[PDB]
Amino acid sequence: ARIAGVEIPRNKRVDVALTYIYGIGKARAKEALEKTGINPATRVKDLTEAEVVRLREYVENTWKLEGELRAEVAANIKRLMDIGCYRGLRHRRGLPVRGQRTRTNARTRKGPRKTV
Amino acid sequence: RLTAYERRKFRVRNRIKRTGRLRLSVFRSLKHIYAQIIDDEKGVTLVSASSLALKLKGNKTEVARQVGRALAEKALALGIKQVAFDRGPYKYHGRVKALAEGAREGGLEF
Amino acid sequence: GSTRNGRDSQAKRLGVKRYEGQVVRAGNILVRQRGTRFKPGKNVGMGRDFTLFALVDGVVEFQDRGRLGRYVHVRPL
Amino acid sequence: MLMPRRMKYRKQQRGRLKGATKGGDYVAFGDYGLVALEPAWITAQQIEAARVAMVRHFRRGGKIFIRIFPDKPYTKKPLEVRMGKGKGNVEGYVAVVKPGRVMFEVAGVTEEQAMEALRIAGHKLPIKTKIVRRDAYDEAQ
Amino acid sequence: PLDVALKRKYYEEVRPELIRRFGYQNVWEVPRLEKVVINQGLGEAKEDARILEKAAQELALITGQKPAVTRAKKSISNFKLRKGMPIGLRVTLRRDRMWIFLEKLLNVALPRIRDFRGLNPNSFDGRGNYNLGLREQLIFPEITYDMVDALRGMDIAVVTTAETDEEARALLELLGFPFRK
Amino acid sequence: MKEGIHPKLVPARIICGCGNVIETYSTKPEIYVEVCSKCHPFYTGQQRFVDTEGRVERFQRRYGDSYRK
Amino acid sequence: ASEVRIKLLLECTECKRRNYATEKNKRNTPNKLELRKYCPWCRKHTVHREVKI
Amino acid sequence: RFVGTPAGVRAGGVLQEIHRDILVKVSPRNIPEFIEVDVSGLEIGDSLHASDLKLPPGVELAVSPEETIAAVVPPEDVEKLAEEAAAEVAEPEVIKKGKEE
RNA sequence: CUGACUGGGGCCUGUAGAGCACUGAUAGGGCUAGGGGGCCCACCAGCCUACCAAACCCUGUCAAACUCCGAAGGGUCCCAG
RNA sequence: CGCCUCCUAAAAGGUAACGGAGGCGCCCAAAGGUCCCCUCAGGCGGGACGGAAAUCCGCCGGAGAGCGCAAGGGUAGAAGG
RNA sequence: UCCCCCGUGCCCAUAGCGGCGUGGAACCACCCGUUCCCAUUCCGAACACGGAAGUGAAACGCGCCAGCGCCGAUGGUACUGGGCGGGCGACCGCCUGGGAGAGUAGGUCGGUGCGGGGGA
RNA sequence: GCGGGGUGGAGCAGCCUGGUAGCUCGUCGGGCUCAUAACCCGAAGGUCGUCGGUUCAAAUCCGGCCCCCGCAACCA
Ligand SMILES: NC(=[NH2+])NCCC[C@H](N)C(=O)O
Ligand SMILES: [Mg+2]
Ligand SMILES: [Mg+2]
Ligand SMILES: [Mg+2]
Ligand SMILES: [Mg+2]
Ligand SMILES: [Mg+2]
Ligand SMILES: [Mg+2]
Ligand SMILES: [Mg+2]
Ligand SMILES: [Mg+2]
Ligand SMILES: [Mg+2]
Ligand SMILES: [Mg+2]
Ligand SMILES: [Mg+2]
Ligand SMILES: [Mg+2]
Ligand SMILES: [Mg+2]
Ligand SMILES: [Mg+2]
Ligand SMILES: [Mg+2]
Ligand SMILES: [Mg+2]
Ligand SMILES: [Mg+2]
Ligand SMILES: [Mg+2]
Ligand SMILES: [Mg+2]
Ligand SMILES: [Mg+2]
Ligand SMILES: [Mg+2]
Ligand SMILES: [Mg+2]
Ligand SMILES: [Mg+2]
Ligand SMILES: [Mg+2]
Ligand SMILES: [Mg+2]
Ligand SMILES: [Mg+2]
Ligand SMILES: [Mg+2]
Ligand SMILES: [Mg+2]
Ligand SMILES: [Mg+2]
Ligand SMILES: [Mg+2]
Ligand SMILES: [Mg+2]
Ligand SMILES: [Mg+2]
Ligand SMILES: [Mg+2]
Ligand SMILES: [Mg+2]
Ligand SMILES: [Mg+2]
Ligand SMILES: [Mg+2]
Ligand SMILES: [Mg+2]
Ligand SMILES: [Mg+2]
Ligand SMILES: [Mg+2]
Ligand SMILES: [Mg+2]
Ligand SMILES: [Mg+2]
Ligand SMILES: [Mg+2]
Ligand SMILES: [Mg+2]
Ligand SMILES: [Mg+2]
Ligand SMILES: [Mg+2]
Ligand SMILES: [Mg+2]
Ligand SMILES: [Mg+2]
Ligand SMILES: [Mg+2]
Ligand SMILES: [Mg+2]
Ligand SMILES: [Mg+2]
Ligand SMILES: [Mg+2]
Ligand SMILES: [Mg+2]
Ligand SMILES: [Mg+2]
Ligand SMILES: [Mg+2]
Ligand SMILES: [Mg+2]
Ligand SMILES: [Mg+2]
Ligand SMILES: [Mg+2]
Ligand SMILES: [Mg+2]
Ligand SMILES: [Mg+2]
Ligand SMILES: [Mg+2]
Ligand SMILES: [Mg+2]
Ligand SMILES: [Mg+2]
Ligand SMILES: [Mg+2]
Ligand SMILES: [Mg+2]
Ligand SMILES: [Mg+2]
Ligand SMILES: [Mg+2]
Ligand SMILES: [Mg+2]
Ligand SMILES: [Mg+2]
Ligand SMILES: [Mg+2]
Ligand SMILES: [Mg+2]
Ligand SMILES: [Mg+2]
Ligand SMILES: [Mg+2]
Ligand SMILES: [Mg+2]
Ligand SMILES: [Mg+2]
Ligand SMILES: [Mg+2]
Ligand SMILES: [Mg+2]
Ligand SMILES: [Mg+2]
Ligand SMILES: [Mg+2]
Ligand SMILES: [Mg+2]
Ligand SMILES: [Mg+2]
Ligand SMILES: [Mg+2]
Ligand SMILES: [Mg+2]
Ligand SMILES: [Mg+2]
Ligand SMILES: [Mg+2]
Ligand SMILES: [Mg+2]
Ligand SMILES: [Mg+2]
Ligand SMILES: [Mg+2]
Ligand SMILES: [Mg+2]
Ligand SMILES: [Mg+2]
Ligand SMILES: [Mg+2]
Ligand SMILES: [Mg+2]
Ligand SMILES: [Mg+2]
Ligand SMILES: [Mg+2]
Ligand SMILES: [Mg+2]
Ligand SMILES: [Mg+2]
Ligand SMILES: [Mg+2]
Ligand SMILES: [Mg+2]
Ligand SMILES: [Zn+2]
Ligand SMILES: [Zn+2]
């Protein structure tokens, strides 16, 4: 559980390895490599402990990650669901939120089909 | 509501009285170690010996052996010869064992 | 009409065989019992089925020691 | 109607009906009582029939205390069989009742209302009865 | 006996502060640490793994002490458990090892917990003891990612000579137990 | 203790990611940890880490007060 | 006794005579019994072996 | 003395006087003629306890304050007879002996 | 002279009666997990129950195979007629 | 249809009915001998996966547990582990 | 012979639960260590050894309180050996000898034998 | 009285030997056909008549009760 709570994949390039962390995509990965001055093409199994402790310290302090980010996403939905807004209804019936059709498809929000 | 100590004490003593001999019971405290030979038929102590009453010295093991000999000497003088060793809650080992071996050395029969 | 009952077992003739004040000889059976209703006392042994028998010639005595149970003794003559 | 919900043993030896009541001989709940004057096995059918009589009398109101319960199983061999071939079958339950016991008590009803209800119920019982009211003698028990 | 950080802290900062906050008329009335009993309730080693010695070896690193086995007191159908089956581990840490474990637990382990928002204040015995639970054994420093095959947490029991919860609450926080409320 | 069945405890040095060094005893003399009590946000008073936001919603609009009145 | 709980003899390994009869469970204890028993012939304790009854 | 006429009694209910007196430690010179109790606030089916007993000077309760003392209960009704009669009863099961018990 | 029977003395016993401490039964009330039902909700709980009711407590009871108790008697040994 | 346990059996023992109720026709190489330790069920509270019940901690708990199998007697001052 | 403590029995809850109080000179205990004897299905917790800085906090000993537990009369009664009456019965009475249980009044926060250590 | 059964909607296994509910049909979804039957490819549904008990655990062993099948009910 090195940085930041997740133990990033060794033997892989340091830029992609960061994407395996909740809160970090390729974008925030390209950022933390300049802002800490580390070579994006090197493997994590080849990171200097100096390079490590800097990348770690920066990323945990600049962005909200793992459990906390999951916490606000939950908190954001919890309120939408509680105020009684439409965005909340769709979260309470587990139906598609973003105005898609529900006659067909919508299989990712509902789950596998329940035939009749 | 009894304790492992009480039960252990009881269990080994009942076993001794059953054989009906005079019993050489041994109390062993943190500093001292006493010993009396009792007739449970009459509820009477017959001969006594202790470190506290013999004002004895340093190593508790070596001390015990001495109170053991003390008991035996006073014992045979009274006609007591054979006797049964009540090890109480104490494992026959170290201080207590030494007290016994001393009583034996002194000519006590057990 | 029939019954599933009808069985029973041979009576085992248990109990005290010598009462207090009675003279017994070495080996006389004193109490026949299941478990220890009476417990072996002075000069009294116990057999593998809790049988109380006099160890010496003498006279029987009973004593009830409260929470310790009842005991049977043979007093030497 | 009144019967045990379960029991250790299914059939019971008949026993005897000697002597005055063991207990339950004093008023203890209501205002007025009905007391048995002679011994009997009082059947569950009778108890219930004696109860219904009283509640029917009150129409609405009053409270009925039933101080006897039929826990004794009543046995009877099938019709026209011969002796032997075991014990009979259970056909009902009775409550053993010896002289002096308060069987029924009423409360929360006028005196003449209690006198009549206990009398009527008295007629559904296979024994002689006596109507009684609460005394200090009852209070002292 | 080894002088250790958390132990010395007990006698120097924790000991006095308690006599202040509660006013004891005797030196023994003050709260002491009795024993820390660590239990791995496992039971994942019932039929499947007769081999759970990895967890014993793991607990042996964490506490510098080899655990004993706990076995099933009675057979149970639903847990696929027959009477006498080996389902857990339990090591009793007393004295200097008790301190050393708590010291590393307080300064290193509890922090390394995923989303650690403080120990639960309400997990208090009522009789003045405390119990807490961990979901991973990677929480401890001696355990690298390499030497772990599969995740397994534990129960931690901390016994106190204190009579009441409040006295117990104080002793541990003073020693460095972080609570959420 | 029983001999030969127990891991040997010796003087140890747990090194944290803030550079902190912990004087303790362990089965391994050197250890490197990513966090400790001296730099963990819950421990260090109340380090808001990255979320010093202050909700921010719902009155956090104020975009703006230019509507007519 | 039964089909699985058999009866057996014990033979004094020294003089080869049978001195004891007893039982065992040949599913639980499939190995031939070895036990020290007093042999009246040899007039001393001796290892006795299970032998077919 | 149960002073007052309960509201349950107005609804047809019945006041069951569980304790028609109460056990009390007291001086001989200090014996009350009675003790009043307000039952006027009793509904079907509410109840008072010895705790709710407001005592004269020098008298002390000798029973558990938890001890119930009076209650108001529903009355007999003929309307209950029909549904009470319609209640069919299953046979008395047997507590068994042996390989069943 | 040891006999039936009788006087005294010890010891053994679990019935009559009674009791509810155990095993079960049991009426009512109290208190209170569980359901049922209604206002109320799906967003996870509330709240009220003239409903069925666990454990516990109180009042009142039942039992050959229940007994915290427990006689009158009865059995046996000793001394005596 | 023989054997074991309880009741009937009237407080010694014994006592019948096609009276009320259950069991046996095995088993254990340790479930045996001895020595040395250990003490239950259950209740409340506390503890990752863990649940009414898995394992751990605390307090209360004379025995209601356990003792291979029916029942009774017995039993932690062990006959139980 | 009187007081306190450490042993060991007896009586077998009038001796117990709970509450409060008190004792460390001595004795006991916890206590200080784990080198050595010996020990932990792990743990010097227990058993054990070597000690004597501390404390009577836990334990234990001694007192006090009747909330619970335990003991419990007298009186009456049930029942009954034996002798008699009554009813068709279920059942009911009388004489004589024996006499409960529940409950009531009340009792109880132990008594005592032997041996040691200390005190008067 | 004696023997034998009660398990998806129907009819039968599983029971004797405790842990593991199976086969045909029917049913729902989809194929082929203009459509339909047949046919092909998928899926659902039994807490085992009950109430009790033994056991770690019961469709399974044991007991009570309900229901159905078969045989018997003779000399009189
Ligand atoms: N003293 C006696 N033993 N009396 C016997 C009592 C029973 C007797 N049949 C009666 O009715 O009175
Ligand atoms: Mg990511
Ligand atoms: Mg769209
Ligand atoms: Mg739409
Ligand atoms: Mg004496
Ligand atoms: Mg029939
Ligand atoms: Mg038959
Ligand atoms: Mg016979
Ligand atoms: Mg025989
Ligand atoms: Mg016979
Ligand atoms: Mg018999
Ligand atoms: Mg007898
Ligand atoms: Mg023998
Ligand atoms: Mg005598
Ligand atoms: Mg004698
Ligand atoms: Mg009739
Ligand atoms: Mg009849
Ligand atoms: Mg005929
Ligand atoms: Mg007949
Ligand atoms: Mg009949
Ligand atoms: Mg009838
Ligand atoms: Mg009656
Ligand atoms: Mg009439
Ligand atoms: Mg009464
Ligand atoms: Mg200290
Ligand atoms: Mg708490
Ligand atoms: Mg504590
Ligand atoms: Mg790790
Ligand atoms: Mg003569
Ligand atoms: Mg004669
Ligand atoms: Mg004679
Ligand atoms: Mg005579
Ligand atoms: Mg006599
Ligand atoms: Mg009777
Ligand atoms: Mg009862
Ligand atoms: Mg009562
Ligand atoms: Mg009766
Ligand atoms: Mg009765
Ligand atoms: Mg009987
Ligand atoms: Mg009886
Ligand atoms: Mg008595
Ligand atoms: Mg008594
Ligand atoms: Mg008598
Ligand atoms: Mg006589
Ligand atoms: Mg003569
Ligand atoms: Mg035979
Ligand atoms: Mg008999
Ligand atoms: Mg008899
Ligand atoms: Mg009998
Ligand atoms: Mg008789
Ligand atoms: Mg005879
Ligand atoms: Mg063994
Ligand atoms: Mg055996
Ligand atoms: Mg054995
Ligand atoms: Mg428990
Ligand atoms: Mg729990
Ligand atoms: Mg949980
Ligand atoms: Mg649990
Ligand atoms: Mg038992
Ligand atoms: Mg069986
Ligand atoms: Mg003493
Ligand atoms: Mg006390
Ligand atoms: Mg003090
Ligand atoms: Mg001192
Ligand atoms: Mg001092
Ligand atoms: Mg060493
Ligand atoms: Mg040395
Ligand atoms: Mg060793
Ligand atoms: Mg120590
Ligand atoms: Mg010790
Ligand atoms: Mg103290
Ligand atoms: Mg002690
Ligand atoms: Mg004290
Ligand atoms: Mg007093
Ligand atoms: Mg009394
Ligand atoms: Mg009297
Ligand atoms: Mg008569
Ligand atoms: Mg009479
Ligand atoms: Mg009379
Ligand atoms: Mg008289
Ligand atoms: Mg009395
Ligand atoms: Mg007391
Ligand atoms: Mg004494
Ligand atoms: Mg003296
Ligand atoms: Mg003296
Ligand atoms: Mg038939
Ligand atoms: Mg079917
Ligand atoms: Mg078959
Ligand atoms: Mg099978
Ligand atoms: Mg289709
Ligand atoms: Mg067309
Ligand atoms: Mg088609
Ligand atoms: Mg069943
Ligand atoms: Mg079981
Ligand atoms: Mg079942
Ligand atoms: Mg199954
Ligand atoms: Mg059946
Ligand atoms: Mg013919
Ligand atoms: Zn740090
Ligand atoms: Zn030979």
PDB file of C-alpha atoms (C1' of nucleotides) and ligand atoms in Angstrom, chain J residues 47 51 53-55, ligand 58:
ATOM      1  C1'   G J  47     -13.821  -7.641  19.409  1.00  0.00           C
ATOM      2  C1'   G J  51     -23.784 -15.076  11.493  1.00  0.00           C
ATOM      3  C1'   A J  53     -24.160 -20.053  17.646  1.00  0.00           C
ATOM      4  C1'   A J  54     -16.635 -20.718  14.849  1.00  0.00           C
ATOM      5  C1'   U J  55     -12.293 -18.365  17.742  1.00  0.00           C
TER       6        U J  55
HETATM    7 MG    MG M  58     -20.002 -13.589  18.461  1.00  0.00          MG
END
